């Protein structure tokens, strides 16, 4: 809550999206694994629609690279102004923006349609219509008079809920809150840390609720989802680096029903 | 007739060849735009990748003939040969490769071409690994003159004879006429082992191009002239494809009408 007030976006990016965790060359790393889950999922042609919302985007865009070719209206979100500012720096190709081009290139590699990475970034930048504040603790996380088209055909969320929740029930309630944004029959792609209890973002020291795969699954069910897919990536030693205590990463593909 | 004079004009004219200007003219946009799949860059990379993907072109050693200051022509090749020789007539080109080999920032940036080859080869290789492997496999950069019967000189370093040759936009760009072109092909063919493969890329119906102050003379050749010379030199032609240069890529840096790609195997 107040902890997120010290949250340094550049320190978070550095910690998680620069070497070693950001080395995309080795297929056995977490970056490649995440992009694979995303790419494979959309390549099924079963997650489709006009509008999409990314929950708790932070200062990162990688989580939409494969998504952006299946949704013409994309909304990004975060609780922090500084994170929203950092996104704009990349959306507007402004000065000092974070360099996502390695991830773009890899999404292009993985998707295998021979797309160049610049075309990919262009499409993402074009389809992102708005960056909005959000609080998942609020039963109406986007507030009242939201410019975002509701309900969304699909949701994506990476490393948010467990990271903003003191315990299971809060995680459960947060999942309930975002779920109200999703149209019935719609899809949620959810990615997150497994059995993590803290991580660092510069001066900020954030508390995390350690969750298991089974816990994640049960929560989705409780929230009204059929779980179509749930995979775990176990975190190799070399990617365990003092910035946190994550044990694995989960990917869930859930369908509101 | 007499070979010496034409060859002499050629040598003379290349003394003004400016590598950076050439790089800019041909490998920066619009020609360097790899995003449009209908462009010449992606066509060239595709010819090479697809050819190497047959698994049919392999061995220990490969020689690139008239590399100039470019490396794109070896990106797909380099997973198939442990020993690669690069070559050029001009020291300033060889220096240019020097800069890239040393991975200096001053170097021309080939990373879009590296990524694009990774993209179409379809193995999910990252571009940094592709580049690191090319840099490792290039064992030497040698002077070369294709008008000499021994284009590498006598008692050359190169492992001869090579298992394969690559050559891009060299032969036609340094030959005053068809008979000169044919002889240059004969000369480099002495470096290839029998049963070896030659991958040849070049300009079709071009008579000139610019490389700075350098406005250089090229023999215009047709696809059929290229086919006959390969046969004349003892190759079976396995593949010969033509790219027609789109109007928007016809930028006044040359009068090229198209580009040819040939896969030929030396008889024996
Ligand atoms: N109460 C709240 N409601 C919604 N998002 C919140 C929140 N409190 C903090 N956040 C955001 O949750 C994010 C967790 S980390 C950023 C994750 C990013 N999507 C990526 O995958 O790396 C931070 O950006 C943080 O600012
Ligand atoms: N007599 C000769 N024998 C062999 N190469 C020569 C030569 N005279 C000039 N060259 C080289 O022929 C090249 C033509 S430009 C082609 C460069 C590169 N292979 C690419 O694909 O773009 C220049 O590098 C030029 O210096
Ligand atoms: N453990 C963890 N927390 C937040 C973001 C991450 C991104 C990539 C790997 C691990 C992460
Ligand atoms: N080197 C060269 N000469 C004429 C036409 C070209 C077209 C595309 C790449 C290189 C070319």
From Swiss-Prot, chain B:
Please give the annotated consequence of changing residue 85 to A. Answer: Significant decrease in protein expression and enzyme activity with octopamine as substrate
Q: Provide one Gene Ontology cellular component.
A: cytosol
Instruction: Kindly report, in one word, the top-level EC class recorded for this enzyme.
Output: transferase
Stated consequence of mutating residue 162 to T? No significant effect on protein expression and enzyme activity with octopamine as substrate
Swiss-Prot/TrEMBL catalytic activity: phenylethanolamine + S-adenosyl-L-methionine = N-methylphenylethanolamine + S-adenosyl-L-homocysteine + H(+); (R)-noradrenaline + S-adenosyl-L-methionine = (R)-adrenaline + S-adenosyl-L-homocysteine + H(+); (R)-normetanephrine + S-adenosyl-L-methionine = (R)-metanephrine + S-adenosyl-L-homocysteine + H(+); (R)-octopamine + S-adenosyl-L-methionine = (R)-synephrine + S-adenosyl-L-homocysteine + H(+)
Highest taxon in the source lineage: Eukaryota
The way its activity is modulated is described as: Inhibited by methyl methanethiosulfonate, phenylglyoxal, tetranitromethane and diethyl pyrocarbonate. Inhibited by 4-oxo-1,4-dihydro-quinoline-3,7-dicarboxylic acid, 4-(benzo[d][1,3]dioxol-5-ylamino)-4-oxobutanoic acid and 1,4-diaminonaphthalene-2,6-disulfonic acid.
The entry marks the following residues as binding S-adenosyl-L-methionine, namely: 22, 27, 66-67, 72, 88, 93, 145-146, 168
* Biological pathway: Catecholamine biosynthesis; (R)-adrenaline biosynthesis; (R)-adrenaline from (R)-noradrenaline: step 1/1
Q: What is its EC number?
A: 2.1.1.28
GO annotation terms (biological process): catecholamine biosynthetic process; epinephrine biosynthetic process; methylation
In terms of Gene3D superfamilies, this protein maps to: Vaccinia Virus protein VP39
Swapping residue 172 to A/Q leads to an effect described as: Strongly reduced enzyme activity towards phenylethanolamine. Increases affinity for S-adenosyl-L-methionine
Phenotypic consequence of residue 206 to A: Reduced enzyme activity towards phenylethanolamine. Decreases affinity for phenylethanolamine 6-fold. Decreases affinity for S-adenosyl-L-methionine 2-fold
InterPro entries hit by this protein: NNMT/PNMT/TEMT_CS, NNMT_TEMT_trans, SAM-dep_methyltransferase, SAM-dependent_MTases_sf
- What is the role of this chain? Catalyzes the transmethylation of nonepinephrine (noradrenaline) to form epinephrine (adrenaline), using S-adenosyl-L-methionine as the methyl donor. Other substrates include phenylethanolamine and octopamine. Also methylates normetanephrine.
In terms of PANTHER family, this protein maps to:
NNMT/PNMT/TEMT FAMILY MEMBER, PHENYLETHANOLAMINE N-METHYLTRANSFERASE
Task: Give the family, as the similarity comment puts it.
Answer: Belongs to the class I-like SAM-binding methyltransferase superfamily. NNMT/PNMT/TEMT family.
- The name on file for this protein is Phenylethanolamine N-methyltransferase
Q: What is the lineage of its organism?
A: Eukaryota, Metazoa, Chordata, Craniata, Vertebrata
In the UniProt record, the gene name given for this protein reads: PNMT
